Amino acid sequence: ECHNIIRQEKKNDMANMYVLLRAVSTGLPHMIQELQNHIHDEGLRATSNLTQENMPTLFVESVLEVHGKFVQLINTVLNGDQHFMSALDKALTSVVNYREPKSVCKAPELLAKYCDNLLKKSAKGMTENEVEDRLTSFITVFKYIDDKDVFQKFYARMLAKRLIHGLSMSMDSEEAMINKLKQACGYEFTSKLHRMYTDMSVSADLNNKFNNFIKNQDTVSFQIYVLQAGAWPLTQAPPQELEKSVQMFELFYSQHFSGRKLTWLHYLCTGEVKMNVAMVTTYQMAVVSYKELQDSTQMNEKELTKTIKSLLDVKMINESSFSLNMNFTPQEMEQTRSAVDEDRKMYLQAAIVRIMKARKVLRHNALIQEVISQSRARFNPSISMIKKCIEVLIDKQYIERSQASADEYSYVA
Amino acid sequence: AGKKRFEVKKWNAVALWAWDIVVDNCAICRNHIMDLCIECQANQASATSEECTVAWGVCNHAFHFHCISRWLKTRQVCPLDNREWE
Ligand SMILES: [Zn+2]
Numbered sequence: 001e002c003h004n005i006i007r008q009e010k011k012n013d014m015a016n017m018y019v020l021l022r023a024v025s026t027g028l029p030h031m032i033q034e035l036q037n038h039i040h041d042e043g044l045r046a047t048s049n050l051t052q053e054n055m056p057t058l059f060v061e062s063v064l065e066v067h068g069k070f071v072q073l074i075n076t077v078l079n080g081d082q083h084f085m086s087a088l089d090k091a092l093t094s095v096v097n098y099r100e101p102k103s104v105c106k107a108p109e110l111l112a113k114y115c116d117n118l119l120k121k122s123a124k125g126m127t128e129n130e131v132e133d134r135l136t137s138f139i140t141v142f143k144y145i146d147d148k149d150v151f152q153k154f155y156a157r158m159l160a161k162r163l164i165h166g167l168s169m170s171m172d173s174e175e176a177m178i179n180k181l182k183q184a185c186g187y188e189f190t191s192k193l194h195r196m197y198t199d200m201s202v203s204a205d206l207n208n209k210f211n212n213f214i215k216n217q218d219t220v221s222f223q224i225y226v227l228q229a230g231a232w233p234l235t236q237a238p239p240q241e242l243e244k245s246v247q248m249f250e251l252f253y254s255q256h257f258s259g260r261k262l263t264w265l266h267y268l269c270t271g272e273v274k275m276n277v278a279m280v281t282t283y284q285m286a287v288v289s290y291k292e293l294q295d296s297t298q299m300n301e302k303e304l305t306k307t308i309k310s311l312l313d314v315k316m317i318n319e320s321s322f323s324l325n326m327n328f329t330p331q332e333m334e335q336t337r338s339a340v341d342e343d344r345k346m347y348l349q350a351a352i353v354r355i356m357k358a359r360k361v362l363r364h365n366a367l368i369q370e371v372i373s374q375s376r377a378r379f380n381p382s383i384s385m386i387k388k389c390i391e392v393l394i395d396k397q398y399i400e401r402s403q404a405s406a407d408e409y410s411y412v413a
Numbered sequence: 414a415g416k417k418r419f420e421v422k423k424w425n426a427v428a429l430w431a432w433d434i435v436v437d438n439c440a441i442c443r444n445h446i447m448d449l450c451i452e453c454q455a456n457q458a459s460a461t462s463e464e465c466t467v468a469w470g471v472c473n474h475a476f477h478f479h480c481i482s483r484w485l486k487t488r489q490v491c492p493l494d495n496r497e498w499e
């Protein structure tokens with residue numbers, strides 16, 4: 001009757017069953033197992049109910065609905081207990097990383113989008129001072145992610161864009177998110193996101209020195225964000241300035257930090273509104289066909305043509321004639337999988353070096369379920385990827401082989 | 414006054430910064446100079462990942478100190494240029 005009773009919400013039979021199964025040694029583990037199966041069934045049903053809709057808020061709310069129902073059930077009729085809670089966590093961990101017949105797992109994308117929708121100043125599906133509770137609840141699903149690596153990278157890109165373009169609602173709220181992600185997934189693992197966040201704040205404070213620098217002398221002020229390149233995913237998109245004395249900023253930063261290299265991301269800079277949305281905030285060419293504005297000074301023409309197209313088709317320029325206006329990411333994530341591949345190869349190189357220092361000779365049959373134990377904190381790799389590591393490290397002078405009648409991988413140092 | 418001014422105004426510049434390499438996964442170690450090398454990453458060392466032990470040559474390009482030391486103990490050439498090491 002355990003199977004029949006744990007799948008029933010009502011009445012005394014559950015209650016006294018839990019008492020008598022606390023008594024028997026074989027009782028509580030069977031209850032735990034049946035409840036784990038029940039939780040996996042319910043969670044899979046709840047997640048799979050959203051076919052072709054795939055709304056991130058409703059996805060997270062489905063997982064949290066199952067979690068809330070089972071927590072309430074456990075406290076109401078079983079007991080608040082580590083074993084039932086662990087069964088819930090394990091089952092939902094198994095659930096969240098999807099296995100649909102015609103689509104690879106989309107959960108880390110939806111979870112990154114949930115965080116961005118929380119933090120956006122638009123705040124369409126979520127609202128400030130409720131976002132705190134929402135992102136507290138998000139930790140429940142955050143612990144359940146298998147490829148925390150993929151979720152972290154996907155959130156990192158949209159974090160970068162939101163903070164650079166000022167789309168985030170509150171800088172403090174972004175820090176609160178990053179702290180919650182750090183305690184959920186690891187401070188060391190989320191450190192790069194923390195550095196990316198820190199760049200805007202520290203550079204904003206450093207602009208208090210840059211303004212004094214600009215006023216110190218003439219003939220060589222504006223805000224700067226200087227970005228720590230090893231963490232940031234954004235690039236220059238290989239662009240005229242609104243204020244246009246950027247070499248003063250370069251001189252200031254170099255003199256302040258004698259030991260740092262730097263380059264300018266003109267594609268991402270922004271200005272200020274209005275002439276006398278009121279949008280003039282990007283790519284102040286100052287001048288006619290849009291293509292003729294490629295007559296700039298010496299500059300990367302790739303970026304130039306991109307900015308020309310952007311300027312032509314937003315708001316401001318109202319081929320035979322032109323005039324000015326009278327008044328006023330799934331493909332990218334799929335692309336980011338490439339950077340994920342590079343990062344995973346680096347990570348597996350480190351992990352394989354640790355494994356090789358632990359045991360100096362091995363074979364791939366033993367390497368299976370050891371690399372998973374050494375990588376599951378971030379991701380759950382494939383055997384082809386593990387072999388992609390090993391069969392290059394043999395020629396990197398990391399691994400060596402001499403055996404003929406059997407497998408081998410011998411550490412090199 | 415006209416609508417075509419594009420006046421000089423308040424502006425928000427953006428830039429990257431790094432330690433002094435054209436990095437492209439610098440050949441002594443398949444890592445960024447702003448991140449731990451393979452040995453320190455495998456060990457998960459307590460050193461600052463952003464600045465593990467950065468050092469500069471006489472040519473003023475940067476290297477990981479551990480990696481250049483290990484390279485120096487076997488070959489007499491600069492790792493990034495293959496000229497005489499200095
Ligand atoms: Zn390197």
Ligand SMILES: [Zn+2]
Pocket residue numbers: 470472474491493494
């Ligand atoms: Zn050199």
